[PDB]
């Protein structure tokens, strides 16, 4: 039930404000905190704000780097990170909770600090029990999402972690396996979205 501001590519030394808001309720009448996930996968509590007593609580490690505010009116929580360095590249989550009831995390906001510019991917068909797929090549920054037949196809889908090639551009392929019989009956379209570069492409994969 939580939404978060989109992925981000921020130049070193510059800044970034991440938003977070709930769909059917106000997160602002519950406790809200933020958590940073970095080097591989590993968690660090940034700080949090309590709905019933003014003042955000900060972890010293981030004192000076992180500013937490809310806007009770619009039910939105914000995290402002200043003076970004490559060590601020991470997935940032906003979490909500109340006493011993729930404790629910948001989807995540990828954040890459780098002077490079955003580049959308080239999407190439990986032409065909049989396997088929899509090559999603030369995009920056991470991440990108791939889906098959607008979500309709989920069995046997295999999407690979992206590799950073020497050019400094990311690359990955998505694959799916289906019945060979199905090759002349079902159309297979992979849909790629790269939010950062406002790049969204549909690619028909058919037998060459």
């Amino acid at each position: 039930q939580l939404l978060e501001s989109g992925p981000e590519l921020v130049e070193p030394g510059a800044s970034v404000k991440v938003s977070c808001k709930a769909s059917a309720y106000s997160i602002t009448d519950f406790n809200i905190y933020w958590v940073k996930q970095s080097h591989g996968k590993n968690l660090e509590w940034i700080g949090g704000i309590d709905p019933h007593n003014g003042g955000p609580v900060y972890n010293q490690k981030f004192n000076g780097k992180a500013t937490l505010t809310v806007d009770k009116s619009s039910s939105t929580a914000f995290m402002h990170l200043n003076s970004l360095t490559s060590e601020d590249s991470a997935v940032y989550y906003c979490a909500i909770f109340y006493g011993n009831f729930f404790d629910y995390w948001g989807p995540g906001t990828t954040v890459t600090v780098s002077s490079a510019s955003t580049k959308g991917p080239s999407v190439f068909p990986l032409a065909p029990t049989a396997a088929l797929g899509c090559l999603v090549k030369d995009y920056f920054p991470e991440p990108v999402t791939v889906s098959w037949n607008s979500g309709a196809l989920t069995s046997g889908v295999h999407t690979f972690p992206a590799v950073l090639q020497s050019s400094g551009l990311y690359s990955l392929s998505s694959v799916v396996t289906v019945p060979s019989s199905s090759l002349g009956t079902q159309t297979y379209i992979c849909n790629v979205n790269h939010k950062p570069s406002n790049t969204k492409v549909d690619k028909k994969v058919e037998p060459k």
Partner: protein, 213 residues
């Protein structure tokens, strides 16, 4: 800062087994500790609060216990969908701190990969480059050697690999090897082959194709 040292760092075990993760606090933190599970491609999800109490919808085969500085998460009927990284959390004293984590892989019978090879799109070639992809699908264990050959000369330096997290349903892995050449390089040779060696195969299997046919 309160340190939470968690172990083991990594653990592999069969479906139906019982295993336990542990965390050591550096200061009695009472029972103000939670346990989180994070599945591949998802945010962490709280399993336990107050060391031994479950959140709604969390299966009973999960249980937490201990106090002071000694905490334990035990999983009693390990299921495939259990494949994840687990974390403990101290919240008795700010700043809140997390343990380093425990990666839980699942032991399954050996299973040989299914090998598929893909030629570059006639559309990619237009732009200057050629990627020849080789897919190894649904195998175990994760260890696998892939060799590229072109006109029977073995390749090195122009390929890259990627592997998926263990599948939650069948506990297999899938891998992709990607051969990147320049258009010219690609049109120089004819036979393109990917050889796969895996302990689930009595002898390396090869999937190849000829350029332009």
């Amino acid at each position: 800062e309160l340190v939470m040292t968690q172990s083991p760092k990594f653990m592999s075990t069969s479906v139906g087994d019982r295993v336990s993760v542990t965390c050591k606090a550096s200061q009695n933190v009472g029972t103000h500790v939670a346990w989180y599970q994070q599945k591949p491609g998802q945010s962490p999800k709280t399993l336990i609060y107050s060391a031994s109490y479950r959140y709604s919808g969390v299966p009973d085969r999960f249980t937490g216990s201990g106090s002071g500085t000694d905490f334990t998460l035990t999983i009693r009927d390990v299921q495939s969908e259990d494949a994840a990284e687990y974390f403990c959390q101290q919240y008795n004293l700010f700043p809140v701190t997390f343990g380093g984590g425990t990666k839980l892989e699942i032991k399954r019978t050996v299973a040989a990969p299914s090998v598929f090879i893909f030629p570059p799109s006639d559309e990619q070639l237009k732009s200057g480059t050629a990627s020849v992809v080789c897919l190894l699908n649904n195998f175990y264990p994760r260890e696998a050697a892939v060799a590229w050959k072109v006109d029977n000369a073995l390749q090195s330096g122009n390929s890259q690999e990627s592997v998926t997290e263990q599948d939650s349903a069948d506990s297999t892995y899938s891998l992709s090897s990607t051969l990147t050449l320049s258009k010219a390089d690609y049109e120089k040779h004819k036979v393109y082959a990917c050889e796969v060696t895996h302990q689930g195969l009595s002898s390396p299997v090869t999937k190849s194709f000829n350029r332009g046919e």
